Amino acid sequence: GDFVRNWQLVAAVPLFQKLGPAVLVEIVRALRARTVPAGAVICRIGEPGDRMFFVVEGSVSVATPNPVELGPGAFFGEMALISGEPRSATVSAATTVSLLSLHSADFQMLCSSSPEIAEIFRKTALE
Amino acid sequence: RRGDFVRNWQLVAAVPLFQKLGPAVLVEIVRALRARTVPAGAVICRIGEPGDRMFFVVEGSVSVATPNPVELGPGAFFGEMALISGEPRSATVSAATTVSLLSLHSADFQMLCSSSPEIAEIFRKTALEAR
Ligand SMILES: [K+]
Ligand SMILES: [K+]
Ligand SMILES: [K+]
Ligand SMILES: [K+]
């Protein structure tokens, strides 16, 4: 129920393309649920990012040069996992939202466990 | 693929025997599952013989030769009792149409229960309360 949905939300990330099922199950369990009040800041531009997000319900507002509104199914902060780079922009709950978070450290160690996974992440990293 | 994983997950997750089991567990079950396709008419299991696996219908139909014949389709499951009791196959099951199946071998089941003993408690309790 929450599992398959979560599965499908995680399965839509590019970055997870070449990973096997056993690994998606891992990324999924590692997901931390969060609800943000309309208007609260999720992440501010410039600060170090240690997690990526998945919109489950509601909307977030990405303060790019041109503001975009992302809704359920959207994910952002992907670079917090491939690079050490700060957040590239400020993100806020446009409406009260429901997010799923994935901390770098969780993914950092998922790769640490299997050499085969660390190599997959390497390849799959350039866009 | 990852597509058939999700449906092999939903297939299993819908069977009562796997009740209140955390994902962490159902993941394991899904990977002990062995895929099989049976030609229309071939016998899957004959009444009286020892059973060492249960089945899950993925696609097509099987024919259970009970007192009254029943036709089970996608989502159905049988042979459960073999994984917990030495008793025989109580009926003759064969593919009605060409059928795609997934089986859980008794032995593969036990290595799962060796991990989390809950599995065996929940499986057996449900299985019998049904009978
Ligand atoms: K804005
Ligand atoms: K049925
Ligand atoms: K049917
Ligand atoms: K039966």
Largest CA distance in chain A: 42
* B18 contacts chain A (CB < 8 A): no
Method: X-ray
How many CB pairs (< 8 A) connect A and B?
Answer: 21
Residue B23 and residue A7: Cβ atoms within 8 Å? no
Residue that the structure tokens 């696609």 belong to: B59
DSSP-derived secondary structure letter, A86: B
One-letter identity of residue A98: S
Nearest to B76 by CA among B19, B23, B6, B14: B14
The range of the structural domain enclosing residue B29 comes to: 1-131
* B7 contacts chain A (CB < 8 A): no
First to last CA, chain B: 37
Q: How many CB atoms lie within 10 A of CB B59?
A: 13
Q: What is the resolution of this structure in A?
A: 2.7
Strand boundaries in chain A, DSSP class E: 32-36, 41-43, 51-57, 60-63, 68-70, 75-76, 90-93, 97-103
DSSP for B29-89, written as a single string = HHTT-EEEEE-TT-EEE-TTSB--EEEEEEES-EEEESSS-EEE-TT-EE-GGGGT---B-
A25 contact residues in B (CB cutoff 8 A): 23, 27
User: How many domains does one find in chain A?
Assistant: 1
Nearest to A28 by CA among A10, A1, A55: A10
Sign of CA dihedral B111, B117, B119, B121: positive
Instruction: Provide the chain B residues 24-43 that lie in CB contact (below 8 A) with chain A.
Output: 24, 27, 31
Q: Residue A28 is part of a domain; what is its CATH number?
A: 2.60.120.10
Q: CB burial class (10 A; 0-12, 13-18, 19+) of residue A54?
A: buried
Sign of CA dihedral A75, A80, A83, A87: positive
Which chain A residue shows the shortest CA-CA distance from B7?
Answer: A4
Q: Rounded distance, CA A75 to CA B32, Å?
A: 32
Mutation target vs A (from B5, B30, B31; most A CBs, 10 A cutoff): B5
Please indicate if the annotation marks A78 as binding a ligand.
Answer: yes
Which tokens in the block code for residue A26?
């891992």
- Any idea which ligand is nearest the CA of A93? 1
CB-based contact B18:B33 (threshold 8 Å)? no
**H or E element: which one contains B122?**
helix B118-130
Task: Give B71 Cα–ligand 3 centroid separation in angstroms.
Answer: 6
A8 contact residues in B (CB cutoff 8 A): 6
Which chain A residue shows the shortest CA-CA distance from B11?
Answer: A4
* CA gyration radius, chain A: 14
Q: At what angle do helices A21-29 and A2-11 cross, to 10 degrees?
A: 110
Residue A29 and residue B23: Cβ atoms within 8 Å? yes
Please list the residues that pair with B43 across neighbouring strands: B94
Q: What is the SS3 string spanning A37-51?
A: CCCCEEECCCCECCE
Task: Give Cα separations from A87 to A45, A50, A124, B39 (angstroms).
Answer: 5, 9, 21, 56
* CA gyration radius, chain B: 14
One-letter identity of residue A64: T
Bridge-based pairing of strands A90-93 and A60-63 is antiparallel
Q: How many CB atoms lie within 10 A of CB B47?
A: 13
Backbone angles phi, psi at A9, to 5 degrees: -70, -45
Q: Output b/e per residue, B76-113; b: 16+ Cβ within 10 A.
A: bbbbbbbbbeeeebbbbbbbbeebebbbbbbebbeebb
Q: Rounded distance, CA B8 to CA A120, Å?
A: 25
Q: CB burial class (10 A; 0-12, 13-18, 19+) of residue B18?
A: middle
